[PDB]
């Protein structure tokens, strides 16, 4: 990771968690002083965040809107189907799926700790554990570039409804079983159904701003 | 467009057209001298090309492989379906589809001129004319970031088979009619069928390297 990428990750986590609010301003000099970093690094960090849709170029934290949320979910669900179908076709031995079981345990541990921040962080390891099965650089880079925006929406859904962690775990368990069963019709059903549900929960939160 | 983006577009067109070959080296100083540009601009231009999958960081033009070609087509077909379905649902008056008819004429004009380079260039205006219907920044930026790689593969298919221009036009006409008919099942059929056909033509060319 370049220093620009480290700074962007730091600011992205603050936007994702709701610590930096919609329309809030980010000043280059304030970030340089708080983090003890070079100004050029901060400038590049903001360009990364803009590329990842989290800020508008100083910079201002981007606003959420229903059309962009719906846009994001319509796209990410098709990318997740592609990833999950590649795991379902390519896994050869059940040992290769063990990463998903460890993530299941990590999600449960964060739920036990009432840790929404860690729950979101661990959710993204699911995609990361799928990448070696797909060996698809275009898909991987696309998903990685969208993870901050997805994170931000997903975090808002959990801020609105803690029981969504229980809901996600139930759907994830169904997805894992469908991948184990190599059932592509069921994989698409689970992802499309949970995707629409989670999107509408984000929209409910947006409507209450 | 920044100067870095202009330089990257210039080098991308040379890779897309086959003027810069797989594994060929690009030297920063050679580009600065040929184009009369700043070295920092060229350095950033290469980072753009690497982000767009056209070079590995000097830099070397990336190699094509069957798994990456299949990866690219599996992804881009789902993105095209998303775009085409949004046009099919959102167009209100047939005047709004006129851009696609003009592109049809431009494709025919390049075919008449035996201009594969211009045919590829005009093909990408189809996606660009679809963006206002989708109003989907995530989808738009994803497609824009993949257009150079798609371009390169598509250009190789036409270098292998000029009659593919006639084939593309026939399929495009069917897609436009399905969009006019707001028939989403037919939209997916046309894009999936042409996608698999064009992908296998690229694979045929790869096998003959």
Residue numbers in the entry:
A (entry chain A), B (entry chain A): 7 to 63, 68 to 219
Copy out sentences from the published article reporting this entry, exactly as the authors wrote them.
In this study, we identified a GntR/VanR transcription regulator AlkR of Pseudomonas aeruginosa SJTD‐1 involved in the negative regulation of AlkB2 and deciphered its nature of DNA binding and ligand release. The dimer of AlkR recognizes and binds to a conserved palindromic motif in the promoter of the alkB2 gene, and structural symmetry is vital for DNA binding and transcription repression.
The asymmetric unit of the structure comprises a dimer of AlkR, with each monomer featuring an N‐terminal DNA binding domain (residues 1–71) and a C‐terminal effector binding domain (residues 76–219). The DNA binding domain of AlkR protein is characterized by the presence of two β‐strands (β1 and β2) and three α‐helices (α1 to α3). The C‐terminal domain contributes to the secondary structure of AlkR protein with six additional helices (α4 to α9), which are indicative of AlkR protein classification within the VanR‐group regulators belonging to the FCD subfamily of the GntR superfamily. A chemical cross‐linking assay with sulfo‐EGS showed that AlkR protein is predominantly in the dimer form in solution, consistent with the results of size exclusion chromatography. In this work, the Apo‐form structure of AlkR dimers revealed that the Arg45 and Arg49 are involved in interactions with the major groove of DNA, by forming hydrogen bonds with specific DNA bases. This interaction is likely pivotal for the recognition and binding of AlkR protein to its specific DNA motif, and removal of the side chains of arginine resulted in the decreased DNA affinity of AlkR protein. Moreover, a flexible sequence (specifically at residues 64–67) in the N‐terminal of AlkR is also important for its DNA binding, predominantly interacting with the minor groove of the DNA helix. Specifically, residues I63 and G68 in AlkR protein are situated on the linker of the flexible minor groove insertion sequence, potentially acting as a scaffold of this region for stabilization by hydrogen bonding via their side chains. The structural modeling results of AlkR protein and C18‐CoA using AutoDock revealed that C18‐CoA was surrounded by the C‐terminal effector‐binding domain of AlkR protein composed of helices α4‒α9.
